[PDB]
Paper text:
The nAChR is a member of a superfamily of pentameric LGICs (pLGICs), which play major roles in fast synaptic transmission in the central and peripheral nervous systems, and are the site of action of many therapeutic drugs. Using the prokaryote ion channel ELIC as a model system, we investigated whether nanobodies could be selected with allosteric modulator activity on ligand-gated ion channels. We discovered functionally active nanobodies, which act either as a PAM or NAM on ELIC, and determined co-crystal structures to elucidate the nanobody interactions with ELIC. The pores of both Nb complexes resemble previous structures of ELIC, with narrow constriction points at the 9ʹ, 16ʹ, and 20ʹ positions, suggesting that the channels are in non-conducting conformations.
When viewed from the top along the fivefold symmetry axis, the nanobodies extend outward and the structure resembles a five-bladed propeller. The PAM-Nb binds to the extracellular ligand-binding domain and forms extensive interactions through the complementarity determining region CDR1 (residues S25-I33) of the nanobody. The tip of the finger of this loop region wedges in between the ELIC β8- and β9-strand, forming a distinct anti-parallel β-sheet interaction with the β8-strand. The PAM-Nb acts as a positive modulator, whereas the CU2017 fragment acts as a negative modulator at the β8-β9 site. The results from this analysis reveal some residues that are uniquely targeted in the PAM-Nb versus the CU2017 complex, which could be responsible for positive versus negative allosteric modulation.
Numbering used by the authors:
A (entry chain J): 1 to 110
B (entry chain I): 1 to 111
C (entry chain H): 1 to 112
D (entry chain C): 111 to 179, 183 to 289, 293 to 319
E (entry chain D): 7 to 179, 181 to 289, 294 to 316
F (entry chain E): 9 to 110
Write the structure that this text describes.
Amino acid sequence: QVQLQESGGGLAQAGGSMRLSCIASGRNFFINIMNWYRQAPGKQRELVAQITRAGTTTYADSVKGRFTISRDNAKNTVYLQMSTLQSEDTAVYYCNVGASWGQGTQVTVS
Amino acid sequence: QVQLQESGGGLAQAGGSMRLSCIASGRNFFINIMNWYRQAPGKQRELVAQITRAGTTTYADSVKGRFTISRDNAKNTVYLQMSTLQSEDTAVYYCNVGASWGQGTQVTVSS
Amino acid sequence: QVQLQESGGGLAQAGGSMRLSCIASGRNFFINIMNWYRQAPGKQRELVAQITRAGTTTYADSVKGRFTISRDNAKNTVYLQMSTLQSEDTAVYYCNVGASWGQGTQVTVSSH
Amino acid sequence: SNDMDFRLFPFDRQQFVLELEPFSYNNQQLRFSDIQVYTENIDNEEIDEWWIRGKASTHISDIRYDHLSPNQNEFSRITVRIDAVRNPSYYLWSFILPLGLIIAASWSVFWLESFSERLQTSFTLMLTVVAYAFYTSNILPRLPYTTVIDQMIIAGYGSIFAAILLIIFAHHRQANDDLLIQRCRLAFPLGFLAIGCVLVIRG
Amino acid sequence: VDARPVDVSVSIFINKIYGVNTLEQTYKVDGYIVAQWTGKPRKTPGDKPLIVENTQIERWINNGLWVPALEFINVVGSPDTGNKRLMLFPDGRVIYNARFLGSFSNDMDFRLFPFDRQQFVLELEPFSYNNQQLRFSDIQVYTENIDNEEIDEWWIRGKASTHISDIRYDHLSVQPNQNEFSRITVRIDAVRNPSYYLWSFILPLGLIIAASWSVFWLESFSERLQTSFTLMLTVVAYAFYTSNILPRLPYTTVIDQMIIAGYGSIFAAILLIIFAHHRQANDLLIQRCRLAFPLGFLAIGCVLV
Amino acid sequence: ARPVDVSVSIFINKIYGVNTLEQTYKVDGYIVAQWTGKPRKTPGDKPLIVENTQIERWINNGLWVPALEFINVVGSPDTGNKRLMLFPDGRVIYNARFLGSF
Ligand SMILES: [Ca+2]
Ligand SMILES: [Ca+2]
């Protein structure tokens, strides 16, 4: 019962930059791990970036060195800085906390 | 120990109509689902119509659009309004509530 | 530990009648069912007649219509009236209540 | 469990019952042919809280269940009843007897010379009944009704309270100390024993 | 490819209601639970209903028999299940019968003690299956084994309240309406037997309080003041006598208030007794308030009702 | 291998039975634990419910159900009904009623 609200997204030029954000809201909860998932047309869902409460960040090989995951722990807000956007990055990005998911924001790149 | 008493039935002309009713009596009970079953002379007992306490109805495909189930909740009474009767509708109609059954009323549709 | 004491028995006449009786005794017991069994010389022990506290009776097919079981509930006494006797009726008759058995009384039907 | 009535406590008689029945089989499938009960291991002594009647009651009956529906609704039941009588010794000596002496000693208030002594002592007597009511309640079993000992306590409260009224009434009644009504040193014991007798017939 | 819900008929037999725990707001209930539904047909020995008891139930479940868990929502701890059986009919019918003894919870208010009225509730719900999967078609309650007597702690109303509702769990969303569960609710109204508390507690307290008013009938200041301490000591002795027997509660009952009134009446008399002795500048007039105190007490007593 | 992420929900129904000398209290509620294991084929490819005694039979056949201990519990808690909800995608939801002294 933790609500996730994604922000940002849209069109981007191949090799520019785009920033996504996700705010988590609820009553009596505590978040340790916040994730970013993406699903490109036809392909299977994949994990992009994962940030623990302690600051450990992990990325998928396809985005390692291009994407950056940051987070404000107190505000339960996670960010995804997508730099040097390839054309493969065309996907709907989902914000995830445990079993909760965000509505999904489209990120197309020409 | 809920008792079900069926009313109505008998002979009816093909293309005509008929109304079956069933009253449930007892003491410390609460009914949610009231059903109408029927058994042809050489077939198995099939669920005809069903009605929930909220009023949502469900019918067998053979009677959909022709039959209508209604109920008075406070009086624990269920009604089966059979319209545009056919020769296939000739069966013993049973009133059902959980494990309880009505005596069974014959409905003979002739020409 | 219910004690059963059979009475009657011995030589009987084919087409005649014989009456067996059985008294049940003990401390703190209640009998619902009282039975009469018989065991022919080389046959198995079979149930002849049975009576419930309510008085309902049941008989083996071989004795139905001929034998009659009765009881006095208060006196814990059961009776067996063996009428229109036959040679097949020759056996050791046992009074029974649960796992308790009577000593067995020999009934010998003669037609000499 | 059994319906147990402890109103006549500590002279109550109880029935310790055992009811046995097949869980899933009616009397057409499983029936009891006989029941034998043995209680030899139980032997009555003065060291026992309860005394058994010795002759245990046994029965085999058919129970018809209303909620069930050609006679497939009857179950064979065994019922065993053991009559017991409570050993009242401890309660007679350590509870009833000292209570009697306390209530009787409360009547001695009518033997005090002055009104001041009669009224002040009544409060010590009232305090003695309260101290006693507790001593009993702390040991006697918890019940949703009053026993015989509980009624004696109420009579003590009544006797002391009634005495208080007479002690005051006698003083401010005359136009100028009604020491004649104070000669009720006999009316209280009698009037109390009289009310005591009519209370016995209630159980 | 749509699966219709399984209609489950329930019967609850109530044998005993006892062991009310005032602080915990709980009560014990001994009874039977009967649950009937229809599964797939099967072959049984001699085409007759098959009885499967106790341990054998697990062996049928291991081999595929569907037997849903019906949880007592308001049970405190796992109930003590006695004998249990399944009756498997060739037509597919299944009847689950089990004896249970459980501790059940409900919001209980004992402020009007010993004249309080309580509701003994049982809430039954499938543990893992929702409306679209398993719903209760009917509920039958039997309270015959509970008969009203003067030797009973509680007086039960024979008219039991039964209800079948749908519970929506806010923490669920398989998003299109898969968050509603079928619940059976049984409510049994009960009234406490106040006889014991009226005669063994309220009555003697009224006598003690009334007898404390007799302090004014003492002739001297020395007698009145000193007697007030014996009276105060009597209320303390009584305050405990009740506390040792009466149930533990997080609030005051009617008896507790009478005790407080007793403390106040004696303490108020101590003030009057002293005020009258040091007002005597020449106070025999004020000392004669033998009618004022009870009237003032009965007045404040009536407004308290 | 990477760590298994477990999402947990705790439902508190009743807090009672404070024992001052023992510094304990009774808690009645539910514990829900969700994680993802290896995908599986389920009857009709719908979530599969496994209740009570049946859970052990699955664990015996290789289903991973980690024990989650109540650190501050006094004695074994009383577990009521318990179930596993197995999804074809590998998701596993463990649900159990509990009554424990903490
Ligand atoms: Ca002994
Ligand atoms: Ca009763």
